[PDB]
Amino acid sequence: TFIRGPICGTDNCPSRLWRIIDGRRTCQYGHVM
Amino acid sequence: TTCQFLTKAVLDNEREQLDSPSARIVVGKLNNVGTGSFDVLAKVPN
Amino acid sequence: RSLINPGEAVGIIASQSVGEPSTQMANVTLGIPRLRE
Amino acid sequence: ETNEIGVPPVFAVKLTYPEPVTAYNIAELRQAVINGPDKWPGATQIQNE
Amino acid sequence: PQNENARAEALNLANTDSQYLTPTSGSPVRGLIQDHISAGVWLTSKDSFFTREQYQQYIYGCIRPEDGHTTRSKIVTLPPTIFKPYPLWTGKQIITTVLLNVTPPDMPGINLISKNKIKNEYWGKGSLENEVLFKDGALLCGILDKSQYGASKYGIVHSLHEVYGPEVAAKVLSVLGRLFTNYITATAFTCGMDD
Amino acid sequence: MIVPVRCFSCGKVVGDKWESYLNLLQEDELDEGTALSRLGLKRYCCRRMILTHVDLIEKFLRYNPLEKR
Amino acid sequence: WNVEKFKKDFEVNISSLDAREANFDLINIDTSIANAFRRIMISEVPSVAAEYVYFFNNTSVIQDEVLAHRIGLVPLKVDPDMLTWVDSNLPDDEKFTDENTIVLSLNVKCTRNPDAPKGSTDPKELYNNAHVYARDLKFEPQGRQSTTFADCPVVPADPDILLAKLRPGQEISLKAHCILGIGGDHAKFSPVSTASYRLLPQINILQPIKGESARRFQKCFPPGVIGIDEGSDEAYVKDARKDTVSREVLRYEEFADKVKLGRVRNHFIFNVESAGAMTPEEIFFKSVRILKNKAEYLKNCPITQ
Amino acid sequence: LKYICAECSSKLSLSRTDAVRCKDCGHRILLKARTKRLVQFEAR
Amino acid sequence: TGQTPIVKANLYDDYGMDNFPNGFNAVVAVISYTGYDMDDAMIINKSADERGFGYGT
Amino acid sequence: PDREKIKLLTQATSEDGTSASFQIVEEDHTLGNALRYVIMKNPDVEFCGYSIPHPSENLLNIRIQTYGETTAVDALQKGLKDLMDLCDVVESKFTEKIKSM
Amino acid sequence: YFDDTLNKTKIKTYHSSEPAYIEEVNLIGDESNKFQELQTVSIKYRIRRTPQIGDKFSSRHGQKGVCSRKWPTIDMPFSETGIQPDIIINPHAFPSRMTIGMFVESLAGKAGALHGIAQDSTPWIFNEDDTPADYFGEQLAKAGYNYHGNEPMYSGATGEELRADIYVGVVYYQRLRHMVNDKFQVRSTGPVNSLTMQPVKGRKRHGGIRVGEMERDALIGHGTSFLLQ
Amino acid sequence: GYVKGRFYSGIKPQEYYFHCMAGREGLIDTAVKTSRSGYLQRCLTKQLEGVHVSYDNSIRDADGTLVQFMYGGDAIDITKESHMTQFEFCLDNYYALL
Amino acid sequence: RKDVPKVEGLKLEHFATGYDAEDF
Ligand SMILES: [Zn+2]
Ligand SMILES: [Zn+2]
């Protein structure tokens, strides 16, 4: 699940944002913000 | 009727002291139904 | 031991206590219209 | 039982009540995490401090 | 609910068992329905008799000490009503057997006198079966009814709720459900054109 | 839509007998009763399968996108 | 009680046996058993059935998933003893073997027969391969199956089962996989087509009945059940086993007091049909066999704390 | 031959930027024909 | 799979609902057995179902 | 040797083992109602019966309460043994009546 | 669909949670003398529907009920004949609904299936002088069943005979709409309506559940107040 | 409208058309009963929402305004009131209740 | 009124397990 944009709001990525409909937005290691 | 009350409400500069649940409900506080009547106070050595 | 408990809600009770059975159902005015009245 | 309620696994998987990581619970919550959102009893997210 | 405060209430305040009664009239809102009533009749009926096998089965059918059901370590069983020729347990004993198991052992049996909605005449001449009687947690007379384990004031479950506290009533009210269901699955029930 | 393969209740395999059943009513001009009995349908379980049946697929077959009129 | 007290008393009567239905009787066995003993035969007796269906193409009017299980319900004449179970934990490639699975292929195109005697309704002549039959399923040997099943190649037990109907230009091309499953798993395994029992209808007379009554009485039951004894004119049960228990007598007040209708205690009439995969007694062995195999399995199981 | 005239049933294929219609009839509605492809179904 | 209802009114054929079977004929026992069919009440034979009974789309 | 098939339920078991509660997976009325019958034939069994806590999931719970002459497990395996031997009787007889017919 | 502007190959995806099949694909051209490539397609999805638990059925007599459980066939009480019922409707669900025709249909349905003959249900073809009960059972008797249609059966679990003959027949049923798969939802995080920062209707976009005053009032009156709030 | 028929035997058409009327009367009445009462209850709840019994047992509206000094006047909880007046029952089971 | 015509020629369709029509 990709959109590349919005890097990652975690300074040990930045790894790579996909938005789920529930709006968590999720980066690959697994921050959900 | 909101405004007609709300009007009169403002006209008196009415302070609302947050008693009725609907009031408390709006603000988002606790209620005075029951599980919110008595306050839980901890204890501690000294 | 059967006493009421301080800090319940009867106001709601008495409301529901009237409200629910209303849903259950000279020539004086009767029923909900009378009750409404 | 009367006081009980049947819960479909669907709802079992979705609904989630985070439990404050303590001691007594860590024996579960580990396995609860390990299980997965796909495997009940599961776990879904983790709130860091 | 998302926090222990909430679910503390959901367990201890708004509850099935905690609420057995109308706030309105103070009447039982809870009880078995439909099938389970009609089962209890054909069970509590005098024409019911059960072998040691059937008897024990129906008990542990609804009891299962494996769970919090049984207050005891074993399942206490009554002597068969008819020893000779052929040992048998009546229906009414099965009820008595349950209450015996699920009630606190330390505490004396319920004692209750009540009616039910079936008049004596239906059973025949000189039958008392309208009158429901418990003495020391035993069912000595009458058949269990909507007026008993259904939702009814001054029924049995309403008395258990009163005497033994709602938790016991809640258990009882569920234990019967499994009992009757089992008994149904045995004898079934039906209504045909002939009826 | 098409002949059920098994009697729901019985589980007996009813799927084949249809063609022969029509054959019976058609050629032999039997009743509905005997043909079924002749096909060896005893349980009214497996009798209703054929008996009540509709081949509605036949109507479907009339619409074929894969061919000219 | 004791097993000998049983083995002495227990008795079997086979009324009839056929490659499909076998109706027999079991005397002095106990309902707790026979029932459970029965319904092992309705469920856990394993048999082969098509399970996974791979469509290469379906152009028919019948949508896929229907025609899928519509195949699955097709019986097969196969000895499940010639096949082995299928582990689900294996990867799909490994999940299937020649020892696991029987492969069935189906390929049909429907084409208009130009020979049609125009003014003809009959689709058999109008079209080519308009109707798809069970007998059309092709068995494809795999590995040793080529050897193994040479004796009795896999055939749908009822070759004339109608699967699909087709119109010209429409085709169906598929491969399906047949495996072992128990009827308990899914409704298409257990090769009963039904299995059941009943009790001997213990019908008994409370006082002699003769005259027109016996005749009237005899009419109240399936024929041959009630003999009218000659010279006493009185009615006697000839054989109850033929009775269907209509309780028709109970409608006639005259006889209502004179006869009780009942079942005997321990006795059973097994009517066991088959899907054609196995003769009933062949099944009925497995009925016994499996039940025994439960205990002998469980006896050997360690009981964990 | 991916497509079928929604009317005359004539089989056809198309190309990029092509008139969508039956080269025979001209019906501008077209069907996508099903082709040999592997699809799995469980008989359950 | 629809079935022509055995029990029928003559108009069913006149209006020709035959062309549109609305349901199926089911072997039904009026009984209290499973106990699961209490309120709404609807017990379906499992195997009967898996035989395609009442399958919709 | 499967250790997941059956498991003693310690909550309702006494310390001596005369009264036990067994749970068995992958079962139903079928095995139980036949099992209990064989078991109840054991004269030392004071109580026996089976429940199916919820029918959806497959679990069979068994009580065996014994007069104390033996443990429950003893009766249980005594029960199973007998049941095994019970089948063979039918297996024997049934085979005979076939070939004799 | 490839996009020229974004110079991307983009995609439409299947929204519904319930897995569907690709039934038909329709290439739709447009009028105004061709030159127009394919701008629009309609797609049939096929969706399997089986009788899931929660699916309303009905007879023709107005008896509506939810399927309670698919019932293991061995556990379904089986006839003297060996016929397990397809459907089992509670006998208690009558006197209240006062539907006799279903009992009658239960007879005739069976009666027909035996003799193989259709049975006219047209209203007012009977009278108090000729009842269908008398009529059809008469046929059942001649068919060798209980004149009342009741049948000897055996509990599928115990195997023992039920207390009394139970009433079996063949009744025409109707599977309805309102399958449970259409109706339910859970836990709506996603929507969080912009004005109120609150969820939204479930439907099929991931909403939630409205509470409301009468539900609010209970909490206050119900007792679960901390929780409720 | 007097109907001599019975559902077992069946009802004449005239009766039937009559009996259909009564049927419609019921169904119409069921619908309207839904809306009407539901509106009433909200009026009560809204105004009575704030009533508080305090640990003095006096009824007080949320602001503190006193309503009743004793709930029933006996302040007896209704859900617990049932068996109180049943003494003969309480006489029996005394050793239990005790 | 003409009563519902009785369907003529209704034999026994039902027979106990393991028997045919001819046996009766
Ligand atoms: Zn990150
Ligand atoms: Zn064209």
JSON list of C-alpha atoms in Angstrom, two decimals, chain E residues 1 3 5-7 9-11 13-15 19 34-36 38-39 42 54 58 183-195, chain K residues 90-94 100 103-104 107 133 146 148 150 155-158 160-167 221-228:
[
{"chain": "E", "resi": 1, "resn": "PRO", "atom": "CA", "xyz": [-16.33, 0.37, 26.93]},
{"chain": "E", "resi": 3, "resn": "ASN", "atom": "CA", "xyz": [-11.58, 1.79, 30.28]},
{"chain": "E", "resi": 5, "resn": "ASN", "atom": "CA", "xyz": [-13.89, 2.64, 35.12]},
{"chain": "E", "resi": 6, "resn": "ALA", "atom": "CA", "xyz": [-16.49, 2.07, 32.45]},
{"chain": "E", "resi": 7, "resn": "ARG", "atom": "CA", "xyz": [-16.45, -1.72, 32.44]},
{"chain": "E", "resi": 9, "resn": "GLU", "atom": "CA", "xyz": [-19.92, -0.20, 36.00]},
{"chain": "E", "resi": 10, "resn": "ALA", "atom": "CA", "xyz": [-20.97, -2.40, 33.10]},
{"chain": "E", "resi": 11, "resn": "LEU", "atom": "CA", "xyz": [-20.08, -5.32, 35.32]},
{"chain": "E", "resi": 13, "resn": "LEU", "atom": "CA", "xyz": [-24.27, -1.65, 37.71]},
{"chain": "E", "resi": 14, "resn": "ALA", "atom": "CA", "xyz": [-25.96, -2.06, 34.36]},
{"chain": "E", "resi": 15, "resn": "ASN", "atom": "CA", "xyz": [-26.16, -5.80, 34.16]},
{"chain": "E", "resi": 19, "resn": "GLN", "atom": "CA", "xyz": [-31.31, -5.99, 36.72]},
{"chain": "E", "resi": 34, "resn": "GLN", "atom": "CA", "xyz": [-42.00, -20.21, 24.91]},
{"chain": "E", "resi": 35, "resn": "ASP", "atom": "CA", "xyz": [-40.42, -23.65, 24.57]},
{"chain": "E", "resi": 36, "resn": "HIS", "atom": "CA", "xyz": [-38.87, -23.70, 28.02]},
{"chain": "E", "resi": 38, "resn": "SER", "atom": "CA", "xyz": [-43.91, -25.88, 27.71]},
{"chain": "E", "resi": 39, "resn": "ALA", "atom": "CA", "xyz": [-40.95, -28.12, 28.48]},
{"chain": "E", "resi": 42, "resn": "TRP", "atom": "CA", "xyz": [-43.96, -32.03, 30.41]},
{"chain": "E", "resi": 54, "resn": "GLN", "atom": "CA", "xyz": [-31.67, -40.35, 32.07]},
{"chain": "E", "resi": 58, "resn": "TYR", "atom": "CA", "xyz": [-30.16, -34.33, 32.46]},
{"chain": "E", "resi": 183, "resn": "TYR", "atom": "CA", "xyz": [-35.12, -32.35, 27.99]},
{"chain": "E", "resi": 184, "resn": "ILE", "atom": "CA", "xyz": [-36.68, -30.94, 24.83]},
{"chain": "E", "resi": 185, "resn": "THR", "atom": "CA", "xyz": [-34.03, -32.52, 22.64]},
{"chain": "E", "resi": 186, "resn": "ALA", "atom": "CA", "xyz": [-35.09, -35.71, 24.36]},
{"chain": "E", "resi": 187, "resn": "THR", "atom": "CA", "xyz": [-38.88, -35.59, 24.18]},
{"chain": "E", "resi": 188, "resn": "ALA", "atom": "CA", "xyz": [-39.29, -32.72, 21.71]},
{"chain": "E", "resi": 189, "resn": "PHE", "atom": "CA", "xyz": [-42.74, -31.17, 21.40]},
{"chain": "E", "resi": 190, "resn": "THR", "atom": "CA", "xyz": [-45.07, -30.22, 18.56]},
{"chain": "E", "resi": 191, "resn": "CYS", "atom": "CA", "xyz": [-48.50, -28.96, 17.56]},
{"chain": "E", "resi": 192, "resn": "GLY", "atom": "CA", "xyz": [-50.34, -30.76, 14.77]},
{"chain": "E", "resi": 193, "resn": "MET", "atom": "CA", "xyz": [-53.64, -30.39, 12.97]},
{"chain": "E", "resi": 194, "resn": "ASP", "atom": "CA", "xyz": [-55.08, -33.00, 15.31]},
{"chain": "E", "resi": 195, "resn": "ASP", "atom": "CA", "xyz": [-54.44, -30.60, 18.18]},
{"chain": "K", "resi": 90, "resn": "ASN", "atom": "CA", "xyz": [-40.94, -23.88, 16.41]},
{"chain": "K", "resi": 91, "resn": "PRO", "atom": "CA", "xyz": [-44.43, -25.19, 17.17]},
{"chain": "K", "resi": 92, "resn": "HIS", "atom": "CA", "xyz": [-44.92, -22.42, 19.73]},
{"chain": "K", "resi": 93, "resn": "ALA", "atom": "CA", "xyz": [-44.85, -19.78, 17.00]},
{"chain": "K", "resi": 94, "resn": "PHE", "atom": "CA", "xyz": [-48.50, -20.28, 16.08]},
{"chain": "K", "resi": 100, "resn": "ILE", "atom": "CA", "xyz": [-53.64, -22.34, 10.21]},
{"chain": "K", "resi": 103, "resn": "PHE", "atom": "CA", "xyz": [-50.54, -26.55, 9.00]},
{"chain": "K", "resi": 104, "resn": "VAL", "atom": "CA", "xyz": [-52.94, -27.26, 6.17]},
{"chain": "K", "resi": 107, "resn": "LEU", "atom": "CA", "xyz": [-50.53, -31.64, 5.02]},
{"chain": "K", "resi": 133, "resn": "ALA", "atom": "CA", "xyz": [-57.89, -31.49, 7.37]},
{"chain": "K", "resi": 146, "resn": "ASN", "atom": "CA", "xyz": [-50.95, -40.61, 9.81]},
{"chain": "K", "resi": 148, "resn": "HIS", "atom": "CA", "xyz": [-53.25, -36.16, 10.98]},
{"chain": "K", "resi": 150, "resn": "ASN", "atom": "CA", "xyz": [-48.02, -36.40, 12.51]},
{"chain": "K", "resi": 155, "resn": "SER", "atom": "CA", "xyz": [-34.24, -37.50, 18.47]},
{"chain": "K", "resi": 156, "resn": "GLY", "atom": "CA", "xyz": [-31.16, -37.23, 16.31]},
{"chain": "K", "resi": 157, "resn": "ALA", "atom": "CA", "xyz": [-28.99, -36.91, 19.39]},
{"chain": "K", "resi": 158, "resn": "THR", "atom": "CA", "xyz": [-30.33, -39.55, 21.76]},
{"chain": "K", "resi": 160, "resn": "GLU", "atom": "CA", "xyz": [-34.70, -42.57, 21.29]},
{"chain": "K", "resi": 161, "resn": "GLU", "atom": "CA", "xyz": [-38.16, -41.93, 19.97]},
{"chain": "K", "resi": 162, "resn": "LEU", "atom": "CA", "xyz": [-39.66, -38.56, 20.69]},
{"chain": "K", "resi": 163, "resn": "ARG", "atom": "CA", "xyz": [-42.45, -38.47, 23.23]},
{"chain": "K", "resi": 164, "resn": "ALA", "atom": "CA", "xyz": [-45.12, -38.31, 20.55]},
{"chain": "K", "resi": 165, "resn": "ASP", "atom": "CA", "xyz": [-45.53, -38.21, 16.80]},
{"chain": "K", "resi": 166, "resn": "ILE", "atom": "CA", "xyz": [-44.48, -34.83, 15.51]},
{"chain": "K", "resi": 167, "resn": "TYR", "atom": "CA", "xyz": [-46.06, -32.93, 12.70]},
{"chain": "K", "resi": 221, "resn": "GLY", "atom": "CA", "xyz": [-31.17, 5.68, 34.49]},
{"chain": "K", "resi": 222, "resn": "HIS", "atom": "CA", "xyz": [-29.60, 2.37, 33.48]},
{"chain": "K", "resi": 223, "resn": "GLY", "atom": "CA", "xyz": [-26.85, 2.78, 36.08]},
{"chain": "K", "resi": 224, "resn": "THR", "atom": "CA", "xyz": [-23.75, 2.38, 33.93]},
{"chain": "K", "resi": 225, "resn": "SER", "atom": "CA", "xyz": [-23.04, 6.10, 34.31]},
{"chain": "K", "resi": 226, "resn": "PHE", "atom": "CA", "xyz": [-19.28, 6.42, 34.44]},
{"chain": "K", "resi": 227, "resn": "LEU", "atom": "CA", "xyz": [-19.16, 3.86, 31.66]},
{"chain": "K", "resi": 228, "resn": "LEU", "atom": "CA", "xyz": [-22.09, 5.44, 29.83]}
]
